[PDB]
């Protein structure tokens, strides 16, 4: 039975899961005692072993999972259905009718990523259990896909289930002063798997076309690809929006929506529906013996988290569009993602707006927060944390400053309870980071990166590293080749 726990609804889960991993990765770069100019960012407060603060994982969990709670009012059912049948026919104009078929239990397999957790059910990472050249998993982790895929074909619907834990990553002091950490939800490799199996094949096809739809998941923003979603912006009203909580705001009437464009290109089939039951059905998180079941919103962690996310988008923008025209008496004649221009990955976005909408902006945004979400124009396009850069080689997409040098001042490496700490870390690899750091320097020119030169070479001395890209010409030239290679 429920019983509150912390003031969150709670049940017993019948297992125990484990607590929430100590300490953190993160260590400061020992060339870097000292504070630097303009620095924005430290590791997240990780609770007991940490002596900047005095909040706890459990609380800061708690705090993460609150939003959860509460049910989110979502779009009302006839407009949320025009909506949705303006997302399947734009989609289905550039990716066509065709039906992708499930995916073989050996090819879902091959695509789990072998560098995360199995979830709350089998410890460990997938990487543990994979035999590199059997070419398959083995031992309890593919015993566990096993009953679950047997499971699936005969309709019987994984668990929705998530091992819940923080986010070990740099974050704004003055969201780490707040007590804020974001929510890790780990997903259960069975439900991943199930999902893969369902649903890659509609992903990869959108993907192919990236970004003539509005799921702009997997562009390459040090590409080709970046350029046409620049050039797709000319014409418009440029709105760069950021939504706060999206994933906690997200409602499940669109969620289910999304699940069911996703499904109209795919073959049917047990697997594929089984697959929209468990991720249309409320996220389960697991902690210690107990776990949280979702009133609303969606887990982070959940399979194809991007996609569904940039589908349940362009619903709630369409329906936040037509709504606007129909309530100033308006028609709408066109598709919305053609007189419209939209770019999502998930939560993130540019909006393209004919001017006719432009007009009529105040009210858009007054219905997507209706909606229960949580939301004026630019020049300047700014999406995956890129600003769109005019350089004297073309429009780049370019990664703020302080991303770029706050990796020389943190590394992640050896847990610990002390980030001033030394650490241990392979050398290749942090100079590999440092080389890319460094081409991504270049792009902004020389003045710019002749600052975050002397910075790698400070790091490298201290960190004891070696590194080529400290040179401008070799940094633009490298930048480049990643460029114009899709590499």
């Known amino acids: 039975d429920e019983f509150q726990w912390k003031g969150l609804p709670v049940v017993k889960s019948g297992l125990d899961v484990g607590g929430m991993p100590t300490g953190t990765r993160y260590h400061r770069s020992p060339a870097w005692p000292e504070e630097q100019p303009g620095e924005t960012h430290a590791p997240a407060p990780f609770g007991s072993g940490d002596k900047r603060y005095t909040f706890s994982q459990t609380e800061m969990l ?3 999972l609150k939003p959860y709670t509460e049910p989110t009012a979502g779009v009302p059912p006839q407009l949320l259905s025009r909506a949705v049948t303006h997302v399947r026919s734009y989609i289905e104009t550039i990716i066509g009718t065709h039906r992708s078929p499930v995916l ?12 995360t957790s199995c979830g709350p059910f089998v410890q460990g990472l997938k990487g543990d259990y994979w035999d590199e050249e059997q070419q398959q998993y083995t031992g309890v982790l593919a015993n566990h896909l096993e009953q679950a895929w047997d499971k699936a074909n005969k309709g019987i619907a994984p668990r929705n289930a998530y091992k819940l834990a923080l986010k070990d ?3 704004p002091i003055e969201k780490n002063k707040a007590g804020k950490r974001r929510l890790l939800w780990g997903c259960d490799a069975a439900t991943t798997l199930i999902a893969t199996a369902a649903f890659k094949a509609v992903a990869t096809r959108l993907q192919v076309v990236t970004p003539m739809t509005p799921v ?4 390459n923003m040090d590409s080709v690809q970046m350029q046409v979603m620049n050039d797709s912006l000319k014409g418009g009203v440029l709105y760069c929006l950021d939504y706060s909580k999206w994933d906690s705001t997200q409602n499940p009437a669109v969620t289910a929506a999304s699940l069911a464009i996703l499904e109209r290109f795919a073959e049917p089939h047990p697997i594929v529906s089984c697959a929209i039951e468990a991720l249309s059905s409320p996220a389960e998180g697991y902690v210690n013996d107990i776990k949280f079941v979702t009133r609303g919103g969606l887990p982070s962690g959940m399979p194809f988290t991007s996609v569904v996310n940039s589908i349940n988008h362009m619903i709630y923008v369409a329906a936040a569009i037509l709504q606007a025209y129909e309530s100033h008496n308006v028609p709408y004649t066109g598709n919305v993602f053609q007189v419209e221009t939209i770019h999502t990955y998930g939560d993130d976005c540019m909006y393209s707006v004919c001017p006719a909408t432009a007009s009529i902006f105040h009210t858009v945004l007054a219905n997507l927060t209706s909606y229960g979400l949580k939301p004026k124009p630019t020049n300047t396009p700014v999406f995956l944390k890129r600003t769109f850069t005019q350089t004297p080689h073309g429009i780049r997409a370019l990664l703020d400053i302080t991303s770029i040098t706050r990796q020389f001042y943190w590394l992640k490496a050896n847990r610990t309870s002390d980030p001033s700490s030394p650490p241990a870390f392979d050398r290749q690899a942090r ?3 440092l080389e890319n750091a460094l ?4 792009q902004h020119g020389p003045v710019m990166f002749d600052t975050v030169r002397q910075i790698a070479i400070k790091t490298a001395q201290g960190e004891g590293l070696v590194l080529v890209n400290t040179n401008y ?15």
């Open 62 to 64: 708690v705090n993460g």
């Open 104 to 115: 073989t239990y050996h090819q879902a397999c091959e695509l789990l990523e072998r560098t």
């Open 169 to 171: 990553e740099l974050r």
């Open 216 to 219: 702009a998941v997997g562009i």
């Open 431 to 433: 100079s590999a980071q």
């Open 439 to 442: 081409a991504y320097a270049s």
């Open 473 to 487: 010409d070799q940094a633009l030239a490298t930048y480049n080749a990643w460029f114009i290679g899709g590499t």
